């Protein structure tokens, strides 16, 4: 049977302070463990 999920997807679709803290957490955790 005919698929339209892609047709619906293309039909339907028509730096921040939050992100920096996630990067800080990432850096902190990686720095603690690595040799």
């Amino acid at each position: 049977d005919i698929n339209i999920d892609d047709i619906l997807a293309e039909l339907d679709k028509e730096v921040s302070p939050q992100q920096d803290f996630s990067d800080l957490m990432k850096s902190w955790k990686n720095e603690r463990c690595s040799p």
Partner: protein, 437 residues
């Protein structure tokens, strides 16, 4: 056989205990406890920032109660004694005792910001201002329930000799207006089950012989009621008497059946609280007694959905042990399109007459229209895949935006229906002309 009794919105019996809930609504709830020959009353609020919970003692044994965000009204059905309490201290409380004929009793009471209302078993209606000044007396069918939201008031009436009926009115300070007066009500009665089943829930039917579990206005003033069949009903098009109609918008039993994996967990009961837009506020009660107890359990939230499904068909479609049953995409899309349509119409009527409260509800209406076309496109594509050009073309008329019609053209191309591509483009050209006009 039937007999008249008092009521208040979503109270509980005493049961085996010395305490009970008198009433509940979105703002709060009221409870009381018996202390030998006296009673203690407590008033609770969900907006703990705006109000203070408090308590006081009653010597008179009130059995009626009504709440709003201005104050609380209390009554005694046999003695005719009543009391109104503002939530502020500044306006001191006041009391009165109302005349009653022999064996007559008060069945319900309600209040607006400036109006006070009382009803009785013998069908007498009496009304007073916020300082007890009498305004008028009227003789009607016996009243069984009352509710109000600002100046809009909704009433229910019942008689052996006149049937079941309802009224809708607006007590405008400019003028008082009636929209319906004791017109017939299509509600599902519980009497057959009470007479035959002998289920040991008889105490609830003694406590509520009408079996009307609760009633309230929506978050946008629509009249709503919850039936003894555990179904939610809403009155649409009330502004237009030749178009006004009752709509069944949610069946609780069907939800629990799916939630249980298609099983009969009759040990579970739903206690409604209030309607917030598209979502029911309710308590999920478990065990012998079909109503909640103290300390108050936390509420739940549940969305409305249209009654379209069938148990046997869904069992066949379905065929870890409690997993909720899987549904055909056709049913899901159909139900969504119906739900989107009804929601959009009700919201449109609200905006047309009363406007926006907050400044963004039009965006929800736009989202509903998008969901509506999206659901129709899935159903349309199914019809095209079945090669039913007649049904597919009939469905295409119901799509709104040319974006969706363009998608329908692509869908028709995938279905290899150039006749339908042609006729859709004829429709698109016709509707483009209508848009140019």
């Amino acid at each position: 056989k039937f007999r008249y009794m008092p009521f208040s919105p979503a109270g509980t019996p005493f049961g085996f205990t010395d305490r009970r809930y008198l009433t509940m609504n979105e703002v709060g709830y009221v409870s009381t406890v018996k202390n030998s020959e006296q009673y203690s009353i407590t008033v609770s609020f969900f907006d703990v920032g705006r109000f203070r919970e408090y308590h006081f003692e009653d010597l008179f044994g009130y059995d009626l109660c009504f709440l709003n965000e201005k104050g609380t009204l209390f009554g005694q059905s046999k003695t005719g004694q009543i009391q109104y309490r503002p939530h502020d201290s500044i306006h001191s409380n006041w009391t009165k005792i109302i005349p009653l004929q022999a064996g007559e009793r008060i069945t319900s009471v309600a209040a607006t910001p400036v109006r006070v209302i009382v009803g009785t078993s013998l069908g007498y209606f009496r009304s007073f201002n916020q300082f007890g000044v009498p305004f008028a007396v009227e003789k009607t069918s016996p009243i069984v329930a009352l509710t109000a939201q600002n100046y809009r008031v909704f009433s229910v009436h019942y008689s052996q000799f006149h049937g079941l009926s309802y009224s809708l009115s607006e007590l405008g300070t400019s003028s008082k207006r009636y929209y319906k007066r004791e017109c017939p009500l299509p509600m599902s009665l519980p009497n057959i089950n009470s007479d035959m089943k002998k289920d040991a829930n008889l105490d609830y039917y003694n406590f509520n012989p009408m079996g009307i579990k609760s009633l309230f206005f929506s978050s946008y003033g629509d009249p709503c009621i919850f039936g003894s069949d555990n179904t939610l009903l809403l009155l649409s098009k009330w502004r237009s008497p030749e178009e006004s109609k009752w709509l069944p918008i949610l069946d609780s039993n069907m939800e629990i059946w799916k939630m249980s994996g298609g099983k009969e967990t009759t040990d579970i009961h739903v206690w409604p609280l209030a309607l917030a837009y598209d979502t029911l506020n309710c308590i999920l009660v478990k065990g012998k007694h079909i109503w909640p107890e103290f300390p108050l359990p936390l509420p739940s939230e549940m969305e409305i959905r249209m009654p379209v499904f069938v148990k046997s068909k869904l069992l066949e479609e379905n065929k870890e042990e409690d997993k909720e049953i899987q549904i055909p995409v056709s049913m899901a899309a159909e139900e969504e399109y119906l739900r989107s349509k009804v929601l959009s119409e009700l919201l449109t009527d609200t905006l047309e007459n009363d406007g926006e409260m907050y400044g963004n509800e039009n965006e929800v209406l736009a989202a509903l229209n998008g969901a509506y076309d999206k659901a129709l496109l899935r159903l349309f594509a199914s019809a095209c895949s079945d090669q039913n050009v007649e049904k597919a073309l009939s469905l295409a008329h119901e799509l709104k935006q040319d974006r969706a019609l363009t998608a329908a053209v692509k869908i028709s191309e995938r279905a290899e229906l150039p006749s339908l591509v042609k006729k859709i483009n004829n429709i698109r050209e016709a509707r483009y002309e209508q848009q140019l006009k």
